[model samples]
Target: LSHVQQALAELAKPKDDPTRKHVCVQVAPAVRVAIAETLGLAPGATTPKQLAEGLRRLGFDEVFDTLFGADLTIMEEGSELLHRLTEHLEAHPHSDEPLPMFTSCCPGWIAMLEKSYPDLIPYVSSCKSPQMMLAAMVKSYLAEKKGIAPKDMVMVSIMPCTRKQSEADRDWFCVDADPTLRQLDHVITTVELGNIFKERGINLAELPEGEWDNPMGVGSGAGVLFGTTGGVMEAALRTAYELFTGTPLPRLSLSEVRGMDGIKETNITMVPAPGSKFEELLKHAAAHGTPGPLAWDGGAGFTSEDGRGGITLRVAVANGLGNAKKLITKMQAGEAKYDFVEIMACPAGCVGGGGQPRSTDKAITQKRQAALYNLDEKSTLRRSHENPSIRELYDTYLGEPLGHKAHELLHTHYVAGGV
Candidate 1:
């Protein structure tokens, strides 16, 4: 047996009757692979299941899934979009100032944009990334559910990127908060996570299957796909469609926005029911520099003045930090336009993050991206809006999207001149 497998087997042994603790573990892919190698496991042989086993054996009382956090981000962001649309309609009436809303979930992208083009800050969404959002909720909401003081709970995240280490250090979520808010606490890369397993002599492959902790532990398939490019757009569509139709979307799968590695754009129009405010918002949003009336049938299927009951929503997805930079420039110049935009740093999405597996070739990142999407396709829950847990969060604690509390926790302010 490989050293990693042997180590995993040793760690899997019950530790004094398996007492349940309240520890949280965050797993990044890079750390997982490193752990496998450290334990004598063959290179590239560590599976997600094995990595999960190692976590369980490491005395983690609760294993929270990061993907779930991604789903929550989509819900919050999508809700923000709808709120902006409403606000624009009320404020402008006939003016255009809210069009070209940009995605700002990626800190790397945000940092670059702030440094290069500070003027575009307003266009970027104020919502935090999935990980940060998850951390906030875990310490606040999840801790409340578990009846534990936020301070007593230990939160650990596993990521494939290393830059995230610095991202966490910036007090991204704790800078202006009460001392009680648990700052990420501890962040370990996949490599570091693997080391912990090695020290304990665990064989990740042999461990029994397990599930993530409750409350913060649950997530929809849409969240899982956030690891890849164009995932945010897909997740948004799932929720946006339902919100407009008041019914489950007929085609939960949106292939049009799935790829295009560089920059992909698509438009969806839901004909407005007679006298519905949905169409009015679309027109107002369009007039405000939002790109629209563009179809995906090599650019077909959109109507400039269709009488249908559905309102058209145009969205564009840009992966890679460089491409994101270009898109921001266009928005700043008043030459580019779009109703909604998605941006991710590190050349892909979360999966290609600085914390993920190290690869020398560019194509490998693409493979990882493809893997993330494949996971999304086979997932049972495909839409962020359809995530029951997110709905539950809204119904129970948040009240509504962009509600006061939600805004306080999920959104943030950006300063110009790198302040």
Candidate 2:
């Protein structure tokens, strides 16, 4: 009720008040997961529709899905990993130099890199966070299609990262703030979202489930996994395993990547293919480096050895800033080695992010992680590339992963001391 008073106050301010203008809300993936739990529904059952209805009821101009951007990140990040793998393999036949590619989402994690691990920045995936990616999309695609000037619309980002309270500069996304291209106007966490609901007399549970606006709505299981600690690694493994081998894994669960352990590691032995021909197929991958469904058997040059080759792929997952601190120390020392590594500055990754509901503890993080695991298990399309909507984006809009369009929008670089 007090927050409501402030909002009403903001609404009535004489001038320089954003409360009176058109504002779009971005409902985080975890927001819907928690809302479902709040309403006693399965986490996966929390539809964008339900969240959209509440936003509309609150008088927000539009409600967008950050998941759509998550899917895009998987595409970009996954492809970058694939091509990098091929590049490394081509350069050094049996070495994992600069391995353990880290995810670049979670501003806290990125900030830590800028603050302490600037030397380690090269190991971080060049891809921007899913949230920022979607923000770019809203300003570019949605704004252009709707014929709305960027300055006319305020972008509201609802996230689980309290650190996100700090804003991104226009130069990062190359936005001039030209009514059509602008930065995020606001970022509020889940707890704050609740306050806003109560202040406005809006009951999300009582509100009807709503659908997310298009172009930013469609997402797949992989996208939803971004909230969990090891989700990025798992999601990438799904695409990486299939793309490299040209065959599906015996099972979908990347038991290696999912967990709450401060540092979880796994060694996956690759299926050895015939040497000479496999070499040709590998070189082919280097040549194309385009994202897509792998042809079964990786074409004629590569033949599946089915665990004959001595290639044992290693991957590690770390949560909590302290754990990340430890891992990076070893990483810099050349002691901790792995092909790919997933790290979240928060203890339980975004699921237990500092911006989540108050009193968050281990149990709460596990519950959220479990919900995402179940969602992944039930998904028929677990890989990012399999997402039909994603394919459509590349086919119609972005060209392909790491393509010119992707480099322009989906990827970014962080100079030392700049977050």
Candidate 3:
């Protein structure tokens, strides 16, 4: 409270950007585990509604959901995966590397890429992290939407890890498109927000449930699922299954990609979905960036036997950085045959993040993970591509997933050099 109070006090004074005061909460997964455990409450006992109300009581002008950004990230990232794979098959026929495109959601994992495997930098999806995406939105889109200037708005992030806190503080967040705005002005841990509640004499557990602010509150279940291990994989698989098969998923539960294992592998062999073009798809991938690889199957091209154009996607997920290292080792040794990869730095993904307060037992983490999965099970809209908010964003503001407007605003590129 002391540190935040100073920033709060400064912002409270009459300023040009009075509408700039806002806080973005992580909403699910870790917040439940950390807050519920800290208060000695049971899992599912506390809801995002209660905490949102508590922040409202604390006088935050606006409260946004982090899940919204997660959904948008899938828009840019999921496309990159399918794009890289089809591109490789269509063009880079002689290349030795597989299209094992890696997820760059976690700052720690991205750091690992820059430091440990700079050669594989090309394999990382160029989508900005969900935090940065929302930050970018707040500064550019929301600011304009609300008629606030980029400089006047102050963005505060509530996250589960210290890495997120420091990562947003980097000056590069202001670059690429907008030089005057930073992605995050401040970052407080889940525990720190709890303390703010305590300092203000507000009991979050006692508060009545309330809804989050505006369109930011509109989040698909896919976004909430990003909080747990393999959640991204599950969400992406749901979309990929539909895109690759060209039909609704007969079974949305992709057991192959959902788990707590340090590293898990899955294989999906499916014919091109109804709308895709296999022959010219090679041309599309070539334009996206990396070209195609000659057919890995017995056939001469990417299609499988039986005349139907079949593409077997080899996807892998790694939770902890240690496991990430091991997986990279396998890939380096020609032992891994993955087409896409999802990696989160924490043991239990963001739920067990370093910034989250310690729990009574590890059960809290699993309970939260299950709670997330259960949320997905009940979601009427399951895939990112199916998200109406995402569709509207493309239809109205940003053009397509990897289109020109998306590249200028929603997407970004990273460096090969290590810090």
Candidate 4:
């Protein structure tokens, strides 16, 4: 049966159960673009509040946004990257270690890596996808807060990813200690969600804009940016820069990583900000401009123009599986070098995902991309670390990024051959 069918069946749970099912949905940011495009409205014309209202009207017991999950991911993944960088520098004082790290946000990308590029598994980040992160919390944190049993909660997600439906069924997401507990119950795609709305005779264009549930509803601009390609890299950099240097990034937008480019390359030279916490480390790590920092230039590392005693991080971004394969091949052949890489299986990331509205024109993805960036630029809080909800989440339950609780819920490992 299709995911939509399974989700509907879950809604009809037998009354003989110990407790009533608590049906809820977590909506992905890209689905908003799908909904707007389906309604012949420009991207961002329809509000997320409207989508929330539409789902509630469709009989969902509760609705939440996946953007909060994105913010959580940035924090977790950023911490992981920083740890990797620190470890590499510690082991190799002045070598081109090339600590290449790959993002694990896209399930489609993960599937390909497990199936074809098993050797690269070690390079993949340990963070779980945003959907699963939210799903895990919904069944654990939110269920407890709402006084609902884990088994009684049917957590569903609306995503712009077809892989997410199957992603929910992965064994890794299941509770090992409690066999009966599962983080996610079902996943519905963007087109399927739109179809559901239409089947119920609900017009999205006319629905009154609604409000999201508390705590998990609000998402930072960086979280919203996760809907587009290069967005994850940009979002990660936003937090990584501040956390690394202890000062805000001179400019929030990393234009080098943005756009529909099949493959993009960029480098950022890290320098201690005026009031950096790591000034001591930076000063000690300085090479006195002797081959300081590393950049891939014909396999011969190049020195930073500034010749400062700081890390120079090279990164690459690739969208679409073909481009990813190409990049991987280049890396394998030692033709390319990067410290961090972002890959999205689709042509334009989630905005042009397999589950999005069917379209032959690539321009539609551009519109969706623009809309997401527009939202990010206009947002008061652009970085994930600045998100108040995320701060509260850490203060109340998660403790800190990469903590034991975060490791248990927010991170996962890859399997070889999709086994």
Which candidate's lDDT is highest? 4
lDDT of 2 by residue, 1-419 (tens): 44324333333444355535555667776766665544444444555565688776666656777766777787887777776666555544222224457777767777878787776667678887777787777777667767776666567677777776453442565465343345565677776776676677776666676655655334422223322323455666656666666666544333433323488877665543445433453434432332211111111222345533334566777777888787766655556666777777786677777766654344876677566544544444455676576677679777878899878877888778864
Candidate 1 lDDT (Cα, 0 to 1) = 0.59
How well is each residue in 74-162 modelled by candidate 1, as lDDT tens digits? 78777766666556544442122254577776677777767776766676777776667777787788777878777656666777666
Error of 2 at 324 (Å): 1.3
How many pairs collide in each candidate, listed in order?
Answer: 40, 12, 14, 0
Deviating ranges (above 4 Å) for candidate 2: 1-22, 35-48, 92-98, 167-171, 176-181, 216-230, 250-261, 272-310, 360-362, 372-381
Q: Could you give me the TM-score of model 1 versus the true structure?
A: 0.74
Whole-model lDDT per candidate: 0.59, 0.62, 0.64, 0.72
Candidate 2 vs. true structure, TM-score? 0.77
At residue 31, what lDDT does model 1 achieve? 46
Candidates 1 and 2 compared: the better one by TM-score is: 2
Local accuracy of candidate 3 as per-residue lDDT tens digits, 344-390? 98877887787777766747677766655446544455566655666
Candidate 3's TM-score: 0.82
- Model 3 scores worst on lDDT over the 10 consecutive residues at 292-301
Residues 56-92 of candidate 4: C-alpha lDDT, one tens digit per residue: 8766777777877777788888887777676554444
**Residue 75: error of model 2 in Å?**
0.4
Q: Output the lDDT of residue 242, model 4.
A: 71
